[PDB]
């Protein structure tokens, strides 16, 4: 979640989507363990390598 900020560099901002340096707005995140996590491991969401 730390990776979502303007000007950063990492496995998401480099290849998934980049926030512009002049970006204005807000970022919101919250807990979804009970819904998006299942016993055994969820492979539903991909990312780039």
């Amino acid at each position: 979640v730390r990776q979502i900020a303007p000007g950063q560099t990492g496995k998401i901002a480099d290849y998934n989507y980049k926030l512009p340096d002049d970006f204005t707005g807000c970022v919101i995140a919250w807990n979804s363990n009970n819904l998006d996590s299942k016993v055994g491991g969820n492979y539903n969401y991909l990312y780039r390598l």
Binding site: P6, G7, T9, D21
Partner: protein, 49 residues
């Protein structure tokens, strides 16, 4: 001497203007190109500024 000072107060005041290009003013390096080599954009701008 009166004319010799006119020439000497110009060349001396001109050399120091060029000589000011080799100072840092607080930046990591005086030369601009080496700043871009080992710095990402969003942190190099504050050094360039």
């Amino acid at each position: 001497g009166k004319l010799q000072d006119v020439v000497n107060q110009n060349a001396q005041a001109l050399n120091t203007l060029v000589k000011q290009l080799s100072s840092n003013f607080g930046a990591i390096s005086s030369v601009l190109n080496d700043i871009l080599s080992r710095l990402d954009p969003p942190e190099a701008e504050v050094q360039i500024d």
